[PDB]
């Protein structure tokens, strides 16, 4: 109905603001488990969970909606997913300028009913081919999956899985790979091995990309940190958050809200400056369900979950595993085959400088939608 479409436009933004707050909650739970490099996709994570919220009912479904920081959206039935599932489309479709390998899988047990309802209706939204499996012949099941993925991923992700419980009702994966074309690629003539303080008492040596010219940035005088916009091609952007020399980056995480991010997005000021930025490459897989449990989404991972709508067959159906693998790399050329060229015309020998030689946070969002593609933290540029 034309009624629906009129709504989906005003709800675009509210949905983006909320899954960024969901993303910062996730980041915090992870940060509780370790201090190392971190990277995951807030968007791909909501998208995936939302699909499940479709097949769920009552207490189960309700709890997911609240847990994803979006019970405030008061729509009609499935419209909530098209937002996410079609945002996925606009990004992988007409947008070649960026990345962007992305997809998900629903490897289910080989006995679930899966009516022609939530199987075709969900394929119309999710577009994630479910794949009944022989979790009994566990050894055979592992191979099949790793292969399925090794295919749709193009070897980018080789062997995702290691083990598989014989009694595995349902496993849900989501991957997302990214490396784009800089709006202003770095000149490899200027990248040099430089000092990177892994912390005040330990330091190492890392390749340090250099770039000059016009960048948009801002310094939050309250928390005392630099915020830097590194534009990609295709209206995707990377925010780099760099605490002043003394303060620790771990502290800032407690204060990350969508409101904050946008308050210093608006105080952005474009100007001429020098920037030193470290090459890196983060690749990580998270057993998201373990984390989404600590965050409150529990029922859909427990015996008494209502996936009645999905597969009425009643034994003990429930999501068994949810795992997201995500990869992101940053050199100075990206997907382009040649790097960039530096020509100095500003002109001055005293423009602002900004060295990323401490650990930092980075976000990757689509300027169009405002949706958070990548939430990350780089403490050690050398590994990952």
């Amino acid at each position: 109905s034309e009624e629906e479409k009129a709504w989906l436009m005003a709800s675009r933004q509210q949905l983006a603001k909320e899954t960024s707050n969901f993303g910062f909650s996730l980041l915090r739970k992870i940060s509780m488990r370790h201090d190392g490099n971190m990277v995951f996709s807030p968007f791909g994570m909501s998208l995936a969970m939302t699909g499940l919220m479709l097949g769920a009912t009552g207490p189960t479904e309700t709890q997911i909606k609240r847990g994803l920081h979006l019970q405030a959206l008061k729509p009609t039935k499935p419209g909530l997913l098209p937002s996410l599932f079609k945002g996925l489309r606009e990004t992988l479709s007409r947008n070649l300028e960026l990345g962007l390998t992305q997809g998900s899988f629903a490897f289910i047990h080989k006995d679930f009913d899966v009516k022609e309802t939530f199987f075709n209706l969900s394929k119309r939204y999710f577009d994630t081919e479910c794949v009944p499996m022989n979790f009994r012949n566990a050894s055979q099941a592992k191979r099949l999956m790793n292969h399925y993925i090794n295919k749709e991923t193009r070897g980018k992700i080789p062997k995702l899985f290691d083990e598989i419980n014989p009694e595995t009702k349902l496993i849900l994966v989501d991957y997302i790979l990214f490396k784009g074309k800089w709006l202003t690629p770095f000149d490899p003539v200027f990248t040099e091995v430089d000092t990177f303080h892994l912390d005040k008492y330990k330091t190492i040596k890392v390749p340090m990309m250099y770039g000059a010219g016009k960048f948009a940035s801002t310094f939050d005088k309250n928390f005392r940190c630099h915020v830097l916009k590194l534009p990609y091609q295709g209206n995707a952007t990377m925010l780099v958050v760099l605490m002043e020399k003394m303060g620790d980056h771990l502290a800032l995480e407690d204060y990350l809200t969508t409101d904050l991010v946008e308050t210093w997005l608006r105080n952005m000021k474009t100007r001429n400056m020098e920037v030193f930025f470290p090459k890196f490459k983060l690749d990580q897989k998270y057993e998201m369900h373990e984390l989404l449990r600590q965050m409150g989404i529990r029922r859909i991972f427990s015996p008494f979950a209502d996936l009645s709508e999905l597969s009425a067959t009643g034994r003990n159906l429930q999501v068994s595993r949810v795992l997201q693998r995500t990869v992101i790399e940053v050199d100075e050329r990206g997907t382009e085959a040649v790097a960039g060229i530096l020509s100095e015309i500003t002109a001055y020998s005293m423009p602002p400088v900004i060295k990323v030689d401490r650990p930092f946070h980075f976000m990757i969002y689509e300027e169009t939608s405002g949706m958070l593609l990548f939430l990350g933290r780089v403490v050690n540029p050398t590994l990952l």
Binding site: R28, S31, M32, R33, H34, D35, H197, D199, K200, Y201, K202, T203, F223, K245, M246, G247, D248, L250, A251, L252, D254, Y255, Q294
Partner: protein, 312 residues
């Protein structure tokens, strides 16, 4: 003997004395072995900063703690406020005597003492969130430099509970207590030092012993007997099994072999460095596998920003 160990690396000029050796490290280095660098910060540097150090480009740089200033030295931390976490010249071992200025007890509508706390600033007191929340008329009580008959009583104006506190997860169990009046220091009491993360996790906690000042509960001898006790870091790995608990990134463990239930929650661990005491941990509700000798503390070095934001 003696310049046989080749103990001088990085171009170290070995001046063979008669009983020991000496070195003149290649320019841009230092130390009795030349394993240092004026570039970075090393925990071994004895002649370094007195408080906080910042790895610079040429040389390193020194910061000072709350209430201090650097002498013309540029490395020293001359205390002048005066409110700067310096324990009076006073040695305390088997006889704790409850004579440390920053410790404090919490009472409610009646003389009931249910929790402990630490003076963090002249008008703020740190304690666990769980405690701060079980009574709505908290008062701060100190016995420091006072006739046991009457203590010092101060009402709590407002309680700032950490905004990311989750009781279920037992994470971020911390609160800041706003005092109605400032503490008349150094007489009435004195704030303990709050450490910078890296400093506290690289040369303090791993490299030196701290003491766990608090009180046992629920019981005593009809008085305020503050009982201290040495503790050392327990590697989180082991600590895992030993307590049947998962150690988040904002908590760590200690041990002493003195089987005392430091029930009082506001109990705290501190460590001293070059003549100043630093609040290293706050004792949550360490449980339940006790195993009383091992303790589960809240890593205070992590909440540095939360303090500055609230207290300014």
């Amino acid at each position: 003997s003696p310049c046989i160990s080749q103990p001088c690396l990085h171009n170290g000029s070995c001046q063979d004395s008669i009983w020991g050796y000496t070195c003149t490290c290649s320019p841009g280095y230092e130390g009795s072995n030349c394993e240092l660098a004026k570039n970075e910060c090393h925990p071994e540097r004895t002649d370094g900063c007195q408080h906080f150090c910042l790895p610079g480009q040429e040389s390193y740089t020194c910061s000072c703690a709350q209430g201090y200033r650097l002498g013309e030295d540029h490395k020293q931390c001359v205390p002048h406020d005066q409110c700067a976490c310096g324990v009076l010249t006073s040695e305390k071992r088997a006889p704790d005597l409850q004579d440390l200025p920053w410790q404090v007890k919490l009472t409610n509508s009646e003389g009931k003492d249910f929790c402990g706390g630490v003076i963090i600033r002249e008008n703020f007191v740190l304690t666990t969130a769980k405690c701060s929340l079980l009574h709505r008329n908290i008062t701060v009580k100190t016995y420091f430099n006072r006739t046991s008959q009457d203590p010092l009583m101060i009402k709590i104006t407002h309680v700032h509970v950490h905004m990311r506190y989750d009781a279920d997860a037992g994470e971020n169990d911390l609160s800041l207590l706003e005092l109605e009046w400032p503490i008349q220091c150094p007489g009435a009491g004195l704030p303990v030092c709050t450490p910078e993360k890296d400093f506290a996790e690289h040369l303090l906690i791993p490299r030196t012993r701290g003491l766990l000042s608090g009180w046992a509960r629920n019981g005593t001898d009809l008085g305020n007997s503050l009982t201290t006790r040495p503790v050392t870091l327990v590697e989180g790995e082991e600590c895992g099994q030993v307590l049947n608990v998962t150690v988040t990134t904002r908590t760590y463990c200690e041990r002493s072999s003195v089987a005392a239930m430091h029930w009082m929650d506001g109990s705290v661990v501190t460590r001293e460095h070059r003549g100043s005491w630093f609040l290293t941990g706050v004792l949550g509700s360490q449980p339940v596998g006790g195993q009383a000798h091992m303790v589960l503390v809240t890593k205070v070095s992590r909440y540095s920003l939360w303090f500055k934001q609230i207290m300014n």
